[PDB]
Amino acid sequence: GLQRTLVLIKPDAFERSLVAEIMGRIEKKNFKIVSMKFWSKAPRNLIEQHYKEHSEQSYFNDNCDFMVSGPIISIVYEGTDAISKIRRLQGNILTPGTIRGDLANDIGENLIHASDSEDSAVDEISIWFPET
Amino acid sequence: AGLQRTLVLIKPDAFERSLVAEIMGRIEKKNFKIVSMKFWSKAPRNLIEQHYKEHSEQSYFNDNCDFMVSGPIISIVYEGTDAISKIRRLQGNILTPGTIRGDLANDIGENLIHASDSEDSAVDEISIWFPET
Amino acid sequence: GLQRTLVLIKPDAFERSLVAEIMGRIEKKNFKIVSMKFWSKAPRNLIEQHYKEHSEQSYFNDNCDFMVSGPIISIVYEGTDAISKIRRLQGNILTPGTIRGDLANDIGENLIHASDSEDSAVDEISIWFPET
Amino acid sequence: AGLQRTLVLIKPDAFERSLVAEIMGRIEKKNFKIVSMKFWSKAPRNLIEQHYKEHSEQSYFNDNCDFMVSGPIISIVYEGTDAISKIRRLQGNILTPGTIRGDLANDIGENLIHASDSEDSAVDEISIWFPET
Amino acid sequence: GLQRTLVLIKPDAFERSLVAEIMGRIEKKNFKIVSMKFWSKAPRNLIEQHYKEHSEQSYFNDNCDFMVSGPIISIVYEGTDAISKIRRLQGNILTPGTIRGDLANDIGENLIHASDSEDSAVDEISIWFPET
Amino acid sequence: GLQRTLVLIKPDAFERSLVAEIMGRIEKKNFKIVSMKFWSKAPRNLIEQHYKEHSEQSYFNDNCDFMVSGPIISIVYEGTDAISKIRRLQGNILTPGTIRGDLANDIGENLIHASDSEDSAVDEISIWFPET
Numbered sequence: 001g002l003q004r005t006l007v008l009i010k011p012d013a014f015e016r017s018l019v020a021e022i023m024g025r026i027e028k029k030n031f032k033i034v035s036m037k038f039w040s041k042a043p044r045n046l047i048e049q050h051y052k053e054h055s056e057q058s059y060f061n062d063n064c065d066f067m068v069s070g071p072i073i074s075i076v077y078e079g080t081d082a083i084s085k086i087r088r089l090q091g092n093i094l095t096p097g098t099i100r101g102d103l104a105n106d107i108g109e110n111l112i113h114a115s116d117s118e119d120s121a122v123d124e125i126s127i128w129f130p131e132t
Numbered sequence: 133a134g135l136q137r138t139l140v141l142i143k144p145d146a147f148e149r150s151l152v153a154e155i156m157g158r159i160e161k162k163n164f165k166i167v168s169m170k171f172w173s174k175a176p177r178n179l180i181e182q183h184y185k186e187h188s189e190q191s192y193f194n195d196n197c198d199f200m201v202s203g204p205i206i207s208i209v210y211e212g213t214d215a216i217s218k219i220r221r222l223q224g225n226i227l228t229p230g231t232i233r234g235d236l237a238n239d240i241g242e243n244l245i246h247a248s249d250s251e252d253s254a255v256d257e258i259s260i261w262f263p264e265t
Numbered sequence: 266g267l268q269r270t271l272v273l274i275k276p277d278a279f280e281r282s283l284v285a286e287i288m289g290r291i292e293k294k295n296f297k298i299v300s301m302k303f304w305s306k307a308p309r310n311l312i313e314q315h316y317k318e319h320s321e322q323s324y325f326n327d328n329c330d331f332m333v334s335g336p337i338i339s340i341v342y343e344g345t346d347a348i349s350k351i352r353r354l355q356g357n358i359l360t361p362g363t364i365r366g367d368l369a370n371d372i373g374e375n376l377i378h379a380s381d382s383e384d385s386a387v388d389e390i391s392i393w394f395p396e397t
Numbered sequence: 398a399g400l401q402r403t404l405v406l407i408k409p410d411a412f413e414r415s416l417v418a419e420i421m422g423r424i425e426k427k428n429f430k431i432v433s434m435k436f437w438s439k440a441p442r443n444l445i446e447q448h449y450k451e452h453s454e455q456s457y458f459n460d461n462c463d464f465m466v467s468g469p470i471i472s473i474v475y476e477g478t479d480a481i482s483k484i485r486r487l488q489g490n491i492l493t494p495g496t497i498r499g500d501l502a503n504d505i506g507e508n509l510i511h512a513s514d515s516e517d518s519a520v521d522e523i524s525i526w527f528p529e530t
Numbered sequence: 531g532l533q534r535t536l537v538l539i540k541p542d543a544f545e546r547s548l549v550a551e552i553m554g555r556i557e558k559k560n561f562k563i564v565s566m567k568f569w570s571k572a573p574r575n576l577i578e579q580h581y582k583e584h585s586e587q588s589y590f591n592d593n594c595d596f597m598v599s600g601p602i603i604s605i606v607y608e609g610t611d612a613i614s615k616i617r618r619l620q621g622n623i624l625t626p627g628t629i630r631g632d633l634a635n636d637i638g639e640n641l642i643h644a645s646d647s648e649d650s651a652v653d654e655i656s657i658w659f660p661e662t
Numbered sequence: 663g664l665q666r667t668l669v670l671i672k673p674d675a676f677e678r679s680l681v682a683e684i685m686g687r688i689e690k691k692n693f694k695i696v697s698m699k700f701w702s703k704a705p706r707n708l709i710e711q712h713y714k715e716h717s718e719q720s721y722f723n724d725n726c727d728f729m730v731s732g733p734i735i736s737i738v739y740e741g742t743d744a745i746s747k748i749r750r751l752q753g754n755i756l757t758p759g760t761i762r763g764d765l766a767n768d769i770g771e772n773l774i775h776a777s778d779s780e781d782s783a784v785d786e787i788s789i790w791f792p793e794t
């Protein structure tokens with residue numbers, strides 16, 4: 001049955017004009033935009049919240065700084081097994097066929113974020129879309 | 133210099149046929165930047181009727197509004213050199229291959245996309261869709 | 266309202282692996298396959314009939330020979346204004362954006378045929394699809 | 398040498414979503430040749446039930462046949478080095494990006510495409526769809 | 531008849547990762563690569579030569595600076611009607627379907643140069659590949 | 663860290679018009695072209711060198727003949743983790759998502775060579791671009 005998951009199109013996707021490329025990959029796998037906001041600049045604490053479970057990490061600040069270094073889009077996708085399948089679609093820069101595997105080559109600038117659990121999903125959605 | 137802003141509507145037939153990223157991608161490939169964007173799961177029939185005010189006396193006016201509310205739409209303010217005209221050309225018409233409608237659309241009504249056609253209608257449409265100015 | 270038109274994917278489309286490329290262009294413009302046959306080799310008189318209005322032309326024989334020099338696909342597409350709009354989609358090798366304009370560069374090997382009138386349409390369909 | 402032939406079905410969800418050329422194109426890009434092709438506007442429920450005989454005792458068997466008759470299908474015999482296995486991998490599954498199903502499908506039932514999985518089921522399926530042998 | 535033409539993939543193509551995209555359009559139109567040269571920065575002399583006609587124009591200096599502001603690729607293409615077809619393929623920033631039509635939006639940063647005439651083709655080929 | 667790697671676009675890429683397609687995949691993964699050479703026919707010496715490890719293998723002669731049976735392009739790519747990422751991008755004819763995975767189907771005619779190691783990368787770059 002349906003799930004929703006949260007996707008962030010990161011600022012590097014704007015710098016490299018891969019926004020539509022990334023969104024189309026999730027679009028062609030038959031997922032739907034239930035919700036979506038463009039942020040010319042995401043307010044920092046939104047980003048910090050979104051990555052709060054990373055607050056103790058070596059990279060936490062640099063990543064938030066990067067995540068704030070350009071536009072981003074937050075999308076709520078709905079579809080069967082959305083969370084897992086979009087996560088897979090995201091992939092990683094070592095796995096060709098996925099978004100990062102095909103278009104990304106950095107440990108921070110990797111184009112996209114996607115929720116990895118029902119709970120991070122539910123959580124991340126409330127962050128970028130509080131009004132529900 | 134020539135930096136304009138124009139209003140694009142991704143129409144509901146775009147979503148129905150999963151052509152949304154395809155349409156935006158053509159605009160993205162031509163080097164235009166999203167300045168603002170709003171996803172509407174269903175647009176208020178009010179905003180549609182405003183957007184299309186100049187057509188209020190046309191035979192197609194209500195069928196079209198019906199359609200513009202049949203599904204999601206995305207309103208996008210695009211910015212870049214000579215944006216209005218260039219994006220208007222990118223929209224094209226169902227008769228000219230090479231354009232969005234030319235390649236992708238085949239109806240007088242369900243034509244995937246709207247683009248402002250003048251500095252005047254742009255400023256105004258940007259107004260209708262993003263009241264925050 | 267609907268029209269049907271007849272499309273031939275020519276043998277050069279098989280040699281150059283542009284079959285799906287061509288069919289997708291007509292597919293993305295929202296036309297439907299109502300009918301379709303693959304011919305590993307089209308019988309010559311089918312080809313000759315199809316081009317019968319060209320029988321007096323300088324190129325008539327060479328073209329039939331070429332049209333017989335590989336597989337072809339005959340498709341009946343249905344859609345609003347099918348005949349005219351697919352014709353346009355076909356285009357010519359001087360008009361970028363069209364099939365020939367983007368992928369073809371010869372006066373004979375031009376990838377695709379599409380009916381240019383309601384009558385040639387009706388006719389060409391009966392040829393490649395007699396069983397109706 | 399390794400020249401095999403395999404049977405591909407473009408399923409009806411492919412037509413519904415206008416992904417037919419996309420699917421065939423992936424097979425075309427990998428250098429496989431169409432040996433035969435049949436457009437069915439609606440497949441005889443008989444041929445579907447034969448094609449899926451090995452599944453006759455499965456919970457999904459009838460839902461699936463219902464679906465395989467819900468729209469057009471195209472049956473294609475593809476030929477090329479190591480075709481069965483290679484095209485089977487090209488089909489993949491809805492879990493593996495990079496493949497047809499991986500990139501394009503998201504259902505246990507509506508998965509765009511069928512490919513033979515063995516020399517045995519190939520010869521047989523080629524038989525079911527092209528009796529002319 | 532069969533001609534050869536000179537294409538320059540300009541540095542914005544590299545900036546925007548459009549090199550393959552550009553070459554791909556010419557490739558798919560069935561034009562062959564006859565020779566080619568990667569230039570991480572083109573000798574300013576060469577650009578000045580290449581754009582000699584333009585030495586009196588306002589945009590001349592600006593253009594040279596840009597033509598040298600990043601890598602370029604110089605390609606010699608061969609094929610039927612190559613000069614004018616590849617010119618058409620190049621197009622302009624107003625009309626979609628073309629390289630510039632689809633991908634460019636500047637009067638100066640326009641991705642690709644293609645010779646526009648029999649003479650200029652000879653001239654330009656000699657500049658970039660003086661070995662013929 | 664940042665490496666350089668040697669890619670060869672093999673003659674079947676040219677036969678099948680896949681050059682841009684291949685380069686495009688590497689381009690979109692964000693790898694830069696550091697230098698490049700078009701070869702209408704590669705000197706057989708060069709191929710023999712390039713495939714030196716393989717001098718004892720059954721397929722060695724067959725391969726040399728093919729590697730010389732049409733044009734090739736030799737490219738030096740630079741980028742983070744370039745050798746192994748571009749190797750992954752090259753892939754194999756079994757697993758889709760890769761260049762070979764999506765576009766190739768022969769044990770010998772497989773479109774692209776990419777260096778597989780730090781050493782072979784140095785070696786191969788020296789063969790094709792001995793000027794460094």
Ligand SMILES: Cc1cn([C@H]2C[C@H](O)[C@@H](COP(=O)(O)OP(=O)(O)O)O2)c(=O)[nH]c1=O
Nearest residue numbers: 054059062063107108109110112113114116
């Ligand atoms: C591990 C890591 C992550 N990041 C950034 C990019 C990651 O997408 C994000 C969270 O890291 P992580 O959860 O490891 O990646 P993923 O998004 O695949 O779950 O933080 C860095 O900037 N540097 C790093 O070293």
Ligand SMILES: Cc1cn([C@H]2C[C@H](O)[C@@H](COP(=O)(O)OP(=O)(O)O)O2)c(=O)[nH]c1=O
Nearest residue numbers: 187192195196225240241242243245246247
């Ligand atoms: C002319 C026409 C327009 N429409 C709708 C679709 C158009 O996008 C919208 C405005 O019409 P118009 O200004 O003619 O189209 P464009 O979007 O090219 O400016 O009205 C119809 O539904 N039926 C019609 O006959």
Ligand SMILES: Cc1cn([C@H]2C[C@H](O)[C@@H](COP(=O)(O)OP(=O)(O)O)O2)c(=O)[nH]c1=O
Nearest residue numbers: 319324327328372373374375377378379381
């Ligand atoms: C004019 C011409 C056509 N042909 C072939 C290719 C054409 O598609 C077909 C019919 O010619 P024509 O009707 O002129 O082209 P179209 O298909 O655009 O109507 O015959 C040649 O082989 N040589 C020629 O000189």
Ligand SMILES: Cc1cn([C@H]2C[C@H](O)[C@@H](COP(=O)(O)OP(=O)(O)O)O2)c(=O)[nH]c1=O
Nearest residue numbers: 452457460461490505506507508510511512
């Ligand atoms: C397992 C399964 C299959 N099917 C349908 C879709 C499959 O293409 C077909 C055969 O099943 P299966 O052999 O599992 O799939 P594949 O096509 O990968 O061999 O049956 C369902 O409708 N529901 C199901 O739960």
Ligand SMILES: Cc1cn([C@H]2C[C@H](O)[C@@H](COP(=O)(O)OP(=O)(O)O)O2)c(=O)[nH]c1=O
Nearest residue numbers: 584589592593637638639640642643644646
């Ligand atoms: C007209 C013009 C050209 N240019 C640059 C871009 C052009 O590709 C180049 C030569 O001009 P031109 O020959 O007009 O361009 P093309 O014939 O390639 O369309 O100089 C400018 O930078 N500014 C200008 O105003």
Ligand SMILES: Cc1cn([C@H]2C[C@H](O)[C@@H](COP(=O)(O)OP(=O)(O)O)O2)c(=O)[nH]c1=O
Nearest residue numbers: 716721724725769770771772774775776778
């Ligand atoms: C194994 C093998 C390789 N080759 C060719 C294709 C290979 O790209 C090349 C070198 O073999 P190999 O190093 O196995 O290929 P790669 O490491 O690039 O996958 O020789 C054959 O022609 N026949 C064969 O049986």
Ligand SMILES: [Mg+2]
Nearest residue numbers: 114115116120
């Ligand atoms: Mg994580």
Ligand SMILES: [Mg+2]
Nearest residue numbers: 186247248249
């Ligand atoms: Mg208007």
Ligand SMILES: [Mg+2]
Nearest residue numbers: 379380381385
């Ligand atoms: Mg004609």
Ligand SMILES: [Mg+2]
Nearest residue numbers: 451512513514
């Ligand atoms: Mg099975």
Ligand SMILES: [Mg+2]
Nearest residue numbers: 583644645646
């Ligand atoms: Mg000029």
Ligand SMILES: [Mg+2]
Nearest residue numbers: 715776777778
């Ligand atoms: Mg090796």
